[PDB]
Amino acid sequence: SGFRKMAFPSGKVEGCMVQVTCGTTTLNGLWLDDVVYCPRHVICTSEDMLNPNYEDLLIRKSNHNFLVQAGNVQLRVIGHSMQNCVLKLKVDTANPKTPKYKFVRIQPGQTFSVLACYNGSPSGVYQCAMRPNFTIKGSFLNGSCGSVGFNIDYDCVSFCYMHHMELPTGVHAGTDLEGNFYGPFVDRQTAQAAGTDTTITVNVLAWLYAAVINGDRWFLNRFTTTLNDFNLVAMKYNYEPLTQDHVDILGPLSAQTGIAVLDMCASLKELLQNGMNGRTILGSALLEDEFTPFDVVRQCS
Amino acid sequence: SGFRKMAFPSGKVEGCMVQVTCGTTTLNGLWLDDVVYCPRHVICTSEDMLNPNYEDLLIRKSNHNFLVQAGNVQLRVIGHSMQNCVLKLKVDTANPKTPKYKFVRIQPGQTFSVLACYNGSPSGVYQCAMRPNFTIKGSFLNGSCGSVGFNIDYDCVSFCYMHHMELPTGVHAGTDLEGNFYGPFVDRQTAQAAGTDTTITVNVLAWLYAAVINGDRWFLNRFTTTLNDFNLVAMKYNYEPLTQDHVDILGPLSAQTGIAVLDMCASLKELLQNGMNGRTILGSALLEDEFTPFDVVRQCSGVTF
Ligand SMILES: O=C(Nc1cncc2ccccc12)[C@@H](O)c1ccc(Cl)c(Cl)c1
Ligand SMILES: O=C(Nc1cncc2ccccc12)[C@@H](O)c1ccc(Cl)c(Cl)c1
Ligand SMILES: [Cl-]
């Protein structure tokens, strides 16, 4: 029993964190096999922040300009290339702590664990969701660039995010491990704004099922709704549309608790209309949207 | 920017998790040097748990009765002893991944990270607080017994908790690594209830400072209070008393934000008597009490391990 925001154990990723220094900029790198991945903006100066030509700046760089440190050992960079917004630094040593891994690009609503690092040293691990506006609501200070988001599948680490920057609202933008940004963001100091954020409806419903599995039933009601009537109500509270894919995904939780998805959808409509009236669900006074249907099943059963 | 519930990186502890099997019971063990620590109830059966004489049950067990597995390698138990509610299994091999560590008993209100394990394999890490009623509001399923709570101080792991059981309300009870239970709990199948819980006042204040550091200032007011007037109000709302030690500990955050502790207490006093009025603090509609003053300083200043 109980329901917590749970991150994956971070050991497999800690053994990959290194410090990457280029001139005056120091950030984090991910050392997998003989390659160190890090944000390409590590090659930027003060004059290069507004409109950097990364291909031009990288061609001017030599391998000896990149200082890579794994613990108290300096690694030798024997090559450098760029893949989208990620810099790949070939090193002369394969990381002996390289876990079984994959690079996976995630969709909005998906959750992952963040290992926040500074100077190639892990300082904390927390759980995040890719917001519908493609930002992440992280906890990052200057120096955290290169910190990664990941999930663990049995023994395999799926790297899904690399931290690049903080937007003016304090939210975070980054890329997958192939250097492709999540969202309409660019690695330039040009004016960029996160789009209006919305609540991840499928995740709220998954969390309502987690609450029922844990014995919290006060919010349940005798009503059901059509999918279309639910979406018309949901949109008015800035909630993401719930698709037939989401209804299907909630099927196992629906079967386990005996509450149809459209039936839970009517509970959610009522909660949006009434609020919680001084009550809590799983110790929370707000509707939690950073637990996916997969997270709920994994944590509860 | 941002403020998250953050656990310590769990790698140093993951390299210590093993699976301990005794008869039909399988749970987790903590392998440090040549000793595997685990809850002593691993030696119990259904009848035994009802009223167990652990000294009697342990004397009947042999070293070969404890099956210890570290990954896919079986460790051989060369000795067994009991220290309070923890079983210590001497093994022939010292854990090569043993970090610098200490066993520390924590006080209520102190936070720690939990590495939840099943079958000696870590499955999740979360941050939580030792409630004033000595329970933890954890997230644990059957098979999680032996999962540990820890903090990291520089390069040293301080083990502070080992999971033993779940109380009827779904909250959790366990011991320090010396086998002493936190709270008035016993490791036996009997009627046990967690006492009425209270809010960890010093931690709420630390979290209000974290909200100010993040730009959330709507709850600040012009007023100040006394430690006595505030404690009278706090007691009324089932909040733990705030001591001069707590005021002193909140000093650095008071200095950084320019908000005196008794100034923040008057904000907390108004929040208690009036509510949030539809507003949130750090995206929460409730006052968060599972961040200590040290946690807030560590997170809002990026200390690494
Ligand atoms: O935002 C950044 N770092 C931070 C990350 N994460 C959190 C931070 C908090 C405060 C200060 C900085 C933070 C920059 O290093 C940065 C600025 C501009 C651009 Cl366009 C790029 Cl690609 C990167
Ligand atoms: O509570 C237990 N385990 C669990 C722990 N933590 C969470 C659990 C969730 C579901 C089921 C079981 C859980 C028991 O194994 C147990 C029963 C009685 C006693 Cl007196 C003792 Cl010492 C231990
Ligand atoms: Cl402090």
XYZ file of C-alpha atoms and ligand atoms in Angstrom:
653
model
C 0.000 0.000 0.000
C 0.863 3.697 -0.370
C 1.567 5.722 -3.479
C 4.646 7.780 -3.957
C 6.281 9.619 -6.797
C 8.986 7.092 -7.400
C 12.082 7.462 -9.533
C 14.056 4.521 -10.952
C 17.213 3.555 -9.023
C 19.900 5.852 -10.513
C 23.067 3.726 -10.167
C 23.210 2.578 -13.800
C 23.140 6.237 -14.898
C 25.491 7.577 -12.135
C 28.297 5.406 -13.529
C 27.923 7.273 -16.868
C 28.045 10.882 -15.622
C 31.162 12.818 -16.573
C 32.161 16.499 -16.597
C 32.704 18.143 -20.044
C 34.623 21.415 -20.223
C 35.070 23.518 -23.320
C 36.880 26.770 -22.708
C 35.010 28.500 -19.899
C 31.826 26.333 -20.025
C 31.551 23.244 -17.840
C 28.527 20.909 -18.015
C 27.623 17.196 -17.784
C 28.216 14.440 -20.286
C 26.834 10.932 -20.614
C 29.684 8.419 -21.148
C 28.419 5.263 -22.911
C 30.961 2.858 -24.471
C 33.677 5.154 -26.006
C 31.333 8.144 -26.623
C 30.525 11.092 -24.347
C 27.233 12.823 -25.224
C 26.539 16.368 -24.075
C 24.586 19.507 -25.244
C 26.302 21.108 -28.248
C 25.967 24.571 -26.622
C 29.092 23.663 -24.528
C 31.108 25.033 -27.547
C 29.391 28.479 -27.278
C 30.845 31.744 -25.970
C 28.963 34.965 -24.848
C 28.952 36.373 -28.437
C 27.637 33.001 -29.774
C 24.503 32.694 -27.629
C 21.985 34.645 -29.739
C 22.633 33.083 -33.212
C 25.289 30.345 -32.998
C 26.402 28.580 -36.171
C 27.290 25.291 -34.487
C 28.779 23.653 -37.605
C 31.139 26.658 -37.945
C 32.059 26.725 -34.213
C 32.668 22.929 -34.096
C 34.933 22.887 -37.182
C 37.187 25.413 -35.336
C 37.490 23.034 -32.361
C 40.152 20.452 -31.816
C 39.961 17.260 -29.683
C 42.376 18.862 -27.171
C 39.868 21.738 -26.609
C 37.417 19.300 -24.916
C 38.382 18.408 -21.346
C 36.444 15.310 -20.162
C 36.665 14.176 -16.557
C 35.297 10.853 -15.242
C 35.777 11.029 -11.480
C 39.364 12.181 -10.947
C 40.565 10.759 -14.274
C 40.811 12.854 -17.417
C 39.601 11.041 -20.548
C 41.303 11.703 -23.895
C 38.982 12.929 -26.653
C 39.995 11.214 -29.937
C 37.094 12.540 -32.072
C 34.126 14.915 -32.137
C 30.959 15.075 -34.176
C 27.537 16.646 -33.850
C 24.180 14.971 -34.180
C 21.434 17.598 -34.169
C 21.800 19.491 -30.781
C 24.037 16.859 -29.129
C 27.817 16.798 -29.272
C 29.402 13.348 -29.431
C 32.945 13.135 -28.114
C 34.748 9.941 -29.005
C 37.106 8.987 -26.131
C 40.023 6.478 -25.943
C 38.397 4.448 -23.127
C 35.105 2.529 -23.122
C 33.138 3.175 -19.912
C 33.446 -0.061 -17.920
C 30.232 0.836 -16.074
C 28.238 1.121 -19.384
C 24.881 -0.518 -18.713
C 22.600 -2.227 -21.284
C 20.949 0.867 -22.844
C 18.786 2.341 -25.600
C 17.970 5.836 -26.797
C 14.199 6.310 -26.885
C 12.228 9.448 -27.832
C 9.161 9.821 -25.587
C 5.734 11.422 -26.183
C 4.049 14.117 -24.004
C 2.578 12.669 -20.838
C 5.352 10.068 -20.538
C 7.284 10.026 -17.284
C 10.978 9.494 -16.564
C 13.531 9.916 -13.785
C 16.021 12.776 -13.863
C 19.511 12.400 -12.421
C 20.433 16.059 -11.710
C 24.216 16.552 -12.025
C 26.704 19.377 -11.519
C 30.329 19.082 -12.642
C 29.803 15.451 -13.678
C 28.624 14.545 -10.140
C 25.060 13.339 -9.389
C 23.308 15.359 -6.701
C 19.729 14.106 -6.841
C 17.137 11.979 -8.544
C 13.522 12.940 -9.142
C 10.549 11.969 -11.261
C 9.274 14.095 -14.201
C 6.770 14.000 -16.990
C 7.165 15.403 -20.491
C 4.445 18.136 -20.367
C 1.967 18.433 -23.277
C 3.782 21.739 -24.167
C 7.045 19.630 -24.420
C 8.735 21.255 -21.462
C 9.637 19.450 -18.246
C 9.013 20.976 -14.804
C 12.412 20.099 -13.446
C 14.577 21.287 -10.611
C 17.742 22.530 -12.180
C 20.364 25.190 -11.437
C 23.138 26.545 -13.743
C 25.599 23.724 -14.464
C 22.855 21.067 -14.730
C 23.032 20.989 -18.595
C 23.742 17.478 -19.788
C 21.763 15.892 -16.849
C 19.640 13.052 -18.251
C 16.130 11.662 -18.076
C 15.716 7.901 -18.184
C 13.552 4.871 -17.496
C 14.656 1.321 -16.640
C 13.218 -1.782 -18.322
C 14.416 -4.704 -16.168
C 18.225 -4.256 -16.699
C 18.117 -1.817 -19.662
C 18.357 1.943 -19.317
C 16.242 3.883 -21.840
C 17.725 7.385 -22.097
C 14.959 9.752 -23.172
C 16.112 13.231 -22.247
C 19.132 15.448 -21.976
C 18.765 18.820 -20.270
C 19.710 21.820 -22.438
C 18.108 24.988 -20.997
C 15.690 26.807 -18.713
C 12.886 28.865 -20.277
C 11.919 32.289 -18.808
C 9.058 30.732 -16.800
C 11.440 28.427 -14.917
C 10.448 25.320 -16.933
C 13.006 23.210 -18.810
C 13.695 22.279 -22.402
C 15.923 19.567 -23.771
C 16.402 16.906 -26.399
C 16.270 13.137 -26.843
C 19.750 11.462 -26.924
C 19.822 11.892 -30.745
C 19.898 15.711 -30.233
C 16.330 16.410 -31.350
C 14.606 18.914 -29.116
C 11.292 18.115 -27.537
C 9.044 21.012 -28.514
C 9.513 24.027 -30.759
C 12.678 25.017 -28.940
C 16.115 25.909 -30.234
C 19.468 26.037 -28.437
C 19.852 29.854 -28.883
C 19.199 32.681 -26.415
C 16.465 33.971 -28.793
C 13.081 34.780 -27.131
C 11.332 31.439 -26.625
C 8.146 30.752 -24.753
C 6.577 27.536 -23.595
C 3.054 27.123 -24.997
C 0.147 27.137 -22.472
C 0.426 23.949 -20.459
C -2.422 21.496 -20.046
C -3.140 18.635 -17.641
C -2.298 15.074 -18.769
C -5.828 13.618 -18.536
C -4.861 9.965 -19.095
C -2.347 10.196 -16.222
C -4.924 11.810 -13.859
C -7.330 8.931 -14.617
C -4.497 6.401 -13.998
C -3.852 8.124 -10.632
C -7.591 8.004 -9.774
C -7.378 4.207 -10.431
C -4.278 4.068 -8.145
C -6.359 5.804 -5.450
C -9.200 3.267 -5.828
C -6.668 0.391 -5.653
C -5.399 1.992 -2.411
C -8.940 2.242 -0.912
C -9.726 5.916 -1.664
C -13.284 5.772 -3.160
C -14.963 9.032 -2.020
C -14.729 10.665 -5.495
C -16.516 7.835 -7.319
C -20.033 8.540 -8.635
C -22.931 6.629 -10.308
C -22.412 8.428 -13.620
C -20.806 7.584 -16.911
C -20.164 9.904 -19.900
C -19.615 9.717 -23.626
C -15.951 10.249 -24.617
C -16.985 13.386 -26.519
C -18.918 14.906 -23.559
C -15.935 14.215 -21.292
C -13.571 15.958 -23.738
C -15.848 19.013 -24.057
C -15.813 19.369 -20.237
C -12.018 18.511 -19.923
C -10.982 21.131 -22.503
C -12.615 23.886 -20.395
C -10.300 23.049 -17.460
C -7.216 23.019 -19.760
C -7.120 19.238 -19.748
C -5.688 17.319 -22.690
C -8.195 15.524 -24.929
C -8.615 11.868 -23.960
C -8.308 9.668 -27.060
C -9.570 6.110 -27.710
C -5.869 5.073 -27.306
C -5.966 6.462 -23.752
C -9.251 4.658 -23.001
C -7.684 1.396 -24.275
C -4.519 1.955 -22.232
C -6.641 2.431 -19.073
C -8.366 -0.945 -19.768
C -6.257 -3.099 -17.364
C -6.863 -0.640 -14.461
C -10.559 -0.530 -15.419
C -10.676 -4.411 -15.283
C -8.780 -4.569 -11.937
C -10.979 -2.024 -10.075
C -14.288 -2.766 -11.855
C -14.801 0.907 -12.814
C -15.250 1.541 -16.590
C -12.996 4.290 -18.074
C -16.001 6.423 -19.003
C -17.319 5.844 -15.460
C -13.955 7.141 -14.031
C -14.184 10.005 -16.570
C -17.469 11.061 -14.917
C -15.715 11.055 -11.479
C -13.018 13.313 -12.967
C -15.674 15.665 -14.457
C -17.248 15.955 -10.994
C -13.869 16.643 -9.332
C -13.197 19.417 -11.890
C -16.606 20.986 -11.091
C -16.541 20.623 -7.269
C -12.934 20.541 -6.315
C -11.978 18.296 -3.396
C -14.016 19.994 -0.625
C -11.205 19.742 1.943
C -10.531 16.092 1.066
C -7.381 14.579 -0.440
C -6.732 11.732 -2.862
C -3.543 9.768 -2.075
C -2.460 12.576 0.292
C -2.776 15.220 -2.426
C -5.242 18.162 -2.634
C -4.631 18.495 -6.421
C -5.184 16.013 -9.254
C -1.792 14.399 -9.964
C -0.870 14.026 -13.667
C 2.736 12.761 -13.524
C 1.915 9.024 -13.139
C 1.213 7.179 -16.366
C -1.060 4.101 -16.608
C 2.180 1.988 -16.853
C 3.591 3.673 -13.667
C 0.405 2.919 -11.693
C 0.354 -0.764 -12.689
C 4.088 -1.149 -11.943
C 3.845 0.557 -8.530
C 0.544 -1.049 -7.415
C 0.928 -4.616 -8.754
C 14.447 26.937 -10.874
C 12.005 24.249 -9.817
C 11.503 22.303 -6.651
C 11.032 18.584 -6.662
C 10.954 15.837 -4.102
C 14.447 14.588 -4.687
C 16.075 11.485 -3.371
C 19.844 10.930 -3.016
C 21.451 9.092 -5.971
C 20.908 5.386 -5.063
C 23.921 3.712 -6.731
C 26.043 3.275 -3.575
C 23.076 1.430 -1.952
C 22.044 -0.585 -5.078
C 25.455 -2.344 -4.968
C 24.540 -3.613 -1.442
C 21.087 -5.097 -2.122
C 20.850 -8.877 -1.931
C 17.986 -11.415 -1.714
C 17.640 -13.392 1.578
C 15.539 -16.558 1.576
C 14.699 -18.561 4.663
C 12.366 -21.456 4.027
C 9.355 -19.991 2.249
C 10.078 -16.287 3.017
C 12.094 -14.195 0.581
C 13.025 -10.587 1.381
C 15.890 -8.081 0.940
C 19.225 -7.905 2.697
C 21.852 -5.178 2.937
C 25.338 -6.618 2.213
C 28.073 -4.476 3.824
C 31.601 -5.915 4.207
C 31.055 -9.634 5.127
C 27.651 -9.110 6.822
C 24.136 -9.264 5.346
C 21.528 -7.381 7.411
C 17.818 -8.140 7.051
C 14.587 -8.142 9.226
C 14.650 -10.997 11.753
C 11.033 -11.935 10.833
C 12.536 -13.751 7.746
C 12.933 -16.785 10.117
C 9.154 -16.833 10.903
C 6.237 -19.005 9.626
C 2.452 -18.073 9.782
C 2.091 -19.569 13.318
C 5.503 -18.195 14.445
C 4.618 -14.556 13.539
C 1.553 -14.633 15.914
C 3.826 -14.807 19.010
C 7.475 -15.400 17.971
C 10.349 -16.306 20.276
C 13.102 -15.162 17.913
C 15.999 -16.498 20.066
C 14.327 -19.959 20.016
C 13.587 -19.857 16.253
C 17.140 -18.663 15.411
C 18.883 -21.344 17.510
C 17.029 -23.987 15.408
C 18.338 -22.494 12.124
C 21.658 -23.480 10.555
C 23.833 -21.334 8.231
C 22.764 -23.423 5.237
C 19.074 -22.562 5.931
C 19.692 -18.936 4.792
C 19.980 -18.674 1.008
C 21.657 -15.347 0.135
C 21.823 -14.224 -3.473
C 23.860 -11.243 -4.747
C 22.842 -10.911 -8.404
C 23.104 -14.418 -9.851
C 25.756 -15.524 -7.330
C 24.864 -17.378 -4.154
C 26.785 -16.208 -1.071
C 27.635 -18.737 1.626
C 26.484 -17.863 5.122
C 29.239 -18.713 7.661
C 27.476 -17.284 10.762
C 24.219 -15.814 12.067
C 23.358 -13.588 14.991
C 20.548 -11.244 15.990
C 20.758 -7.633 17.057
C 17.354 -6.438 18.259
C 14.926 -6.887 15.260
C 17.706 -7.279 12.626
C 19.316 -10.554 11.611
C 23.023 -10.414 10.786
C 24.272 -13.096 8.417
C 28.035 -13.400 8.257
C 29.077 -14.359 4.697
C 32.438 -15.665 3.356
C 32.816 -12.779 0.878
C 33.207 -9.070 1.628
C 31.023 -6.935 -0.701
C 33.494 -5.357 -3.117
C 30.929 -2.595 -3.742
C 30.764 -1.664 -0.011
C 30.693 2.136 0.125
C 31.921 4.361 2.989
C 28.975 4.000 5.403
C 27.593 4.554 8.924
C 24.494 3.376 10.774
C 22.615 6.383 12.108
C 19.321 6.591 13.948
C 17.262 9.573 12.769
C 14.736 11.748 14.614
C 11.096 12.384 13.517
C 10.958 15.082 10.842
C 14.270 14.000 9.331
C 14.030 12.850 5.687
C 15.824 10.047 3.861
C 15.703 8.229 0.541
C 14.155 4.759 0.292
C 15.475 2.235 -2.209
C 12.435 -0.078 -2.625
C 13.589 -3.616 -3.468
C 11.951 -6.920 -4.359
C 13.954 -10.151 -4.493
C 17.207 -8.265 -3.823
C 16.637 -6.079 -6.904
C 16.081 -2.294 -6.614
C 12.911 -1.144 -8.344
C 12.475 2.457 -7.212
C 13.820 5.303 -5.135
C 11.738 7.874 -3.301
C 12.225 10.524 -0.684
C 10.217 10.527 2.512
C 10.121 11.736 6.109
C 10.070 9.883 9.415
C 6.664 11.080 10.626
C 6.332 12.428 14.200
C 4.282 9.204 14.934
C 7.410 7.238 13.762
C 5.790 5.713 10.707
C 6.759 6.460 7.125
C 4.210 7.023 4.401
C 6.047 4.722 2.007
C 5.168 2.882 -1.152
C 5.743 -0.769 -0.501
C 4.275 -4.092 -1.647
C 4.823 -7.628 -0.173
C 8.481 -8.593 -0.691
C 9.765 -5.077 0.101
C 10.925 -6.017 3.680
C 14.615 -5.316 4.069
C 14.454 -2.243 1.718
C 16.541 0.557 3.251
C 16.361 4.257 3.975
C 19.523 6.311 3.690
C 21.128 9.721 3.358
C 24.438 10.634 1.720
C 26.846 12.994 3.526
C 29.731 13.825 1.170
C 30.844 10.297 -0.015
C 29.409 8.430 3.042
C 26.108 6.598 3.101
C 24.222 6.886 6.416
C 21.814 3.942 6.647
C 18.914 5.021 8.837
C 16.028 2.657 8.079
C 15.147 -0.889 7.227
C 11.582 -1.798 6.246
C 9.833 -4.359 8.419
C 6.036 -4.060 7.969
C 2.857 -2.288 6.867
C 0.366 -1.104 9.471
C -3.424 -1.487 8.906
C -3.711 2.128 7.689
C -1.260 1.461 4.827
C 1.630 3.319 6.561
C 4.994 1.655 7.237
C 7.071 0.692 10.230
C 10.702 -0.309 10.444
C 13.927 -0.106 12.405
C 17.330 1.601 12.328
C 20.204 -0.699 11.108
C 20.828 -1.746 14.743
C 17.341 -3.402 14.782
C 15.632 -0.835 17.007
C 12.154 0.008 15.780
C 11.172 3.566 15.112
C 7.973 3.973 17.136
C 6.079 1.784 19.568
C 5.919 -1.075 17.105
C 6.820 -4.739 17.406
C 7.596 -7.373 14.737
C 4.731 -9.667 15.554
C 1.243 -10.296 14.150
C -0.857 -8.369 16.688
C -3.110 -5.259 16.778
C -0.844 -2.232 16.248
C -1.927 1.268 15.303
C 0.002 4.340 14.291
C -0.570 7.213 16.702
C -2.269 10.417 15.491
C 0.152 12.125 13.131
C 1.251 15.739 13.299
C 2.769 18.120 10.709
C 6.533 18.705 10.731
C 6.504 22.501 11.302
C 10.229 23.166 10.733
C 10.000 21.367 7.380
C 6.893 23.346 6.279
C 8.789 26.581 7.061
C 11.819 25.286 5.082
C 9.478 24.561 2.135
C 7.945 28.060 2.419
C 11.558 29.392 2.103
C 12.060 27.148 -0.950
C 8.879 28.671 -2.472
C 10.205 32.222 -1.842
C 13.566 31.245 -3.432
C 11.521 30.069 -6.437
C 9.537 33.348 -6.677
C 6.295 32.295 -4.908
C 5.704 35.130 -2.437
C 1.913 35.637 -2.242
C 1.748 34.127 1.303
C 4.289 36.567 2.762
C 2.890 39.251 5.013
C 4.128 42.222 7.021
C 3.656 40.454 10.350
C 5.887 38.699 12.797
C 5.044 36.532 15.836
C 6.683 35.030 18.970
C 7.819 31.407 19.270
C 5.248 31.047 22.128
C 2.190 32.596 20.283
C 3.083 30.587 17.179
C 3.445 27.294 19.143
C 0.013 27.906 20.713
C -1.454 28.252 17.182
C 0.586 25.375 15.761
C -0.549 22.971 18.568
C -4.187 23.865 17.765
C -3.649 22.645 14.154
C -1.760 19.379 15.030
C 1.574 20.893 14.093
C 4.762 19.891 15.893
C 6.191 22.498 18.332
C 8.864 24.712 16.777
C 11.933 24.904 19.037
C 14.745 27.500 19.209
C 16.923 24.762 17.549
C 14.518 24.820 14.564
C 14.624 28.627 14.416
C 18.461 28.486 14.428
C 18.514 25.783 11.729
C 16.257 27.976 9.520
C 18.754 30.883 9.943
C 20.607 30.483 6.609
C 17.303 30.426 4.638
C 16.111 33.472 6.679
C 19.350 35.318 5.776
C 19.122 34.371 2.054
C 15.477 35.393 1.579
C 15.445 38.356 3.994
C 12.473 36.851 5.820
C 12.993 36.265 9.588
C 11.824 32.845 10.903
C 9.119 34.432 13.137
C 8.128 36.535 10.060
C 7.702 33.246 8.077
C 5.818 31.801 11.146
C 3.217 34.611 10.934
C 2.750 33.632 7.230
C 2.356 29.985 8.304
C -0.068 31.070 11.068
C -2.273 32.935 8.522
C -2.054 29.971 6.072
C -3.356 27.667 8.854
C -6.219 29.937 10.023
C -7.322 30.984 6.497
C -6.215 28.326 3.956
C -4.710 28.896 0.498
C -7.852 30.563 -1.013
C -7.582 28.616 -4.272
C -3.867 29.378 -4.610
C -0.925 26.947 -4.604
C 2.652 27.084 -3.303
C 5.206 25.247 -5.518
C 2.270 23.646 -7.377
C 0.812 22.214 -4.174
C -2.538 23.085 -2.482
C -1.278 21.607 0.846
C 1.639 22.645 3.054
C 4.499 20.218 2.276
C 6.399 18.888 5.343
C 8.804 16.321 3.835
C 11.675 18.722 3.004
C 14.007 19.576 5.879
C 15.913 22.886 6.065
C 19.052 21.002 4.901
C 17.131 19.464 1.950
C 16.025 22.942 0.803
C 19.585 24.348 1.068
C 21.045 21.273 -0.726
C 18.478 21.519 -3.585
C 18.448 25.328 -3.956
C 22.365 25.312 -4.013
C 23.158 22.041 -5.951
C 25.343 19.988 -3.530
C 26.688 16.808 -5.289
C 27.518 13.159 -4.222
O 19.651 27.844 -19.241
C 20.806 27.457 -19.061
N 21.179 26.695 -18.014
C 20.360 26.246 -16.966
C 19.711 25.013 -16.980
N 18.811 24.615 -16.075
C 18.516 25.456 -15.094
C 19.094 26.738 -14.938
C 18.742 27.628 -13.892
C 19.308 28.868 -13.816
C 20.244 29.277 -14.756
C 20.619 28.444 -15.774
C 20.053 27.147 -15.902
C 21.887 27.820 -20.074
O 23.151 27.210 -19.844
C 21.561 28.196 -21.498
C 21.151 29.484 -21.797
C 20.691 29.806 -23.057
C 20.640 28.834 -24.036
Cl 19.853 29.200 -25.529
C 21.092 27.552 -23.767
Cl 21.055 26.330 -24.994
C 21.550 27.232 -22.501
O 3.568 -6.488 6.402
C 4.257 -7.297 5.781
N 4.845 -7.022 4.594
C 4.692 -5.858 3.816
C 5.527 -4.745 3.911
N 5.315 -3.573 3.297
C 4.235 -3.465 2.536
C 3.303 -4.510 2.323
C 2.164 -4.380 1.489
C 1.312 -5.432 1.307
C 1.548 -6.649 1.930
C 2.630 -6.816 2.747
C 3.541 -5.753 2.976
C 4.517 -8.673 6.385
O 5.452 -9.459 5.659
C 4.462 -8.850 7.890
C 3.261 -9.168 8.509
C 3.132 -9.110 9.882
C 4.218 -8.749 10.657
Cl 4.014 -8.605 12.372
C 5.442 -8.488 10.059
Cl 6.846 -8.171 11.022
C 5.562 -8.532 8.681
Cl 21.055 24.813 7.019
